[PDB]
């Protein structure tokens, strides 16, 4: 298995996707059910940091992560307080470019 050969045929893998326009609809002070219905179910949510709904994406090809874009959102008292991640920027750029 060592010293792999240049067999140029490798399956592409993905991790999650999110709609760009719906990202702009996010507003601070949002409840859990409404944000889940509006943006989508998070594909990665640990049980060690309950409040940390995450969304990622990685077109992988033999370990080498080609492209990625992650979006996080933090909750407390059952209401949205703040978000972060490079997804907001690229989402805004794509919304300004397409529309």
């Amino acid at each position: 298995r060592v010293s792999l050969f240049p067999s140029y045929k490798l399956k592409i893998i993905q991790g999650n996707e999110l709609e760009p326009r719906a990202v702009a609809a996010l507003r601070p002070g949002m409840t859990k059910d409404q944000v889940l219905l509006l943006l989508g179910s998070p594909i990665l949510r640990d049980a060690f940091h309950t409040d940390r709904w995450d969304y990622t994406f990685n077109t992988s090809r033999n370990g080498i992560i080609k492209e990625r874009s992650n979006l996080t959102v933090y909750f407390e008292n059952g209401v949205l307080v703040r978000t972060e991640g490079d997804a907001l920027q690229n989402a805004a750029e794509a919304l300004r470019a397409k529309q």
């Binding site: 399956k11 594909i43 049980a47 990622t56 990685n58 990625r68």
Partner: protein, 233 residues
Amino acid sequence: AQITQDWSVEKLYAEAQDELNSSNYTRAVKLYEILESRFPTSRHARQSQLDTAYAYYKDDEKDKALAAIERFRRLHPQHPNMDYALYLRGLVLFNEDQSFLNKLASQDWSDRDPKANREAYQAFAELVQRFPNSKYAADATARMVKLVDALGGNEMSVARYYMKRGAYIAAANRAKKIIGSYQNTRYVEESLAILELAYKKLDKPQLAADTRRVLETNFPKSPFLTHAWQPDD
């Protein structure tokens, strides 16, 4: 039906059991129902209802075995030999796969399926709950713990296969499932390590630090602290 000869129920049962001993099943089942059709009011009828399911278990087919064992379950719900029914159902539904062509004495049991294993575990749980003290209960508990270990092994194998492909986003979820719903098994101090590796491979330092802290406070001496995880084989 070709002989249909009058006899005594005792010699019918003797002929039936000695044909069973001679690895005769196709002709046995056809000579099993004849005695209960001719003599329904007899304990030999119930003995036939049991050993026909036993013989069906001795062969590869299982649907007829399940049908017969359910027939007995619904027919005599209070016979003292009810313990044999549940145990036979558990062994049939476990898919023992009794064949010397594929003995493989190791048989880690992490390959058969989740379906039959789960149903056999449920059957043995019903058995141990019904008869907590019978002629055989410790064997039931041993097979039950072996089956839950096999389920844990299947989950761990599915988790491991994804880590060799790059889909860390899936190994993370599968390891989280194993951590949160598969205690009492042996795959605990490895699921944490593979989850840490998956979190680190996706540029999430806080998650990796937290899960590594949990690992080190739950296992002070483990090779996964110094050496990062590495898929074997």
